[PDB]
């Protein structure tokens, strides 16, 4: 693993300590603003479920994707920063995000 943001965060957040996860997205917004998405635009999830919601506005996100030569234990990621709408699946009470469906 290099020293770029993705390699470091994937490791510190216990995502690549025991394996190399292909892709992961990190959202750079306050926790409460992300939780607020669960009462925003209702949309169908990729699986057909209807408990997904899309944020009205774009949010700061970092996409982490394994490179072609990445192999455990030396996971390697390409870091891509962008501003896009997030789509999350919400459940429970309080109604909060439990899955990151996608980003637009």
């Amino acid at each position: 693993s290099s020293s770029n943001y993705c390699n470091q965060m994937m490791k510190s957040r216990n995502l690549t300590k025991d394996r190399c996860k292909p892709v992961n997205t990190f959202v750079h917004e306050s926790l409460a603003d992300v939780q607020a998405v669960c009462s925003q635009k209702n949309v169908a999830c990729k699986n057909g479920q209807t408990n997904c919601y899309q944020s009205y506005s774009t949010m700061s996100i970092t996409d982490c994707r394994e490179t072609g030569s990445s192999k455990y234990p030396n996971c390697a990621y390409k870091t891509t920063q962008a501003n896009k709408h997030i789509i999350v699946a919400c459940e429970g009470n309080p109604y909060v995000p439990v899955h990151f469906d996608a980003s637009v």
């Binding site: 992961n24 990190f26 926790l31 429970g92 995000p97 439990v98 899955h99």
Partner: peptide, 15 residues
């Protein structure tokens, strides 16, 4: 141990 909500935060949130 951790809930689905907690897992989401650990894996995706970086305030």
């Amino acid at each position: 141990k951790e809930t689905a909500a907690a897992k989401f935060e650990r894996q995706h949130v970086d305030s």
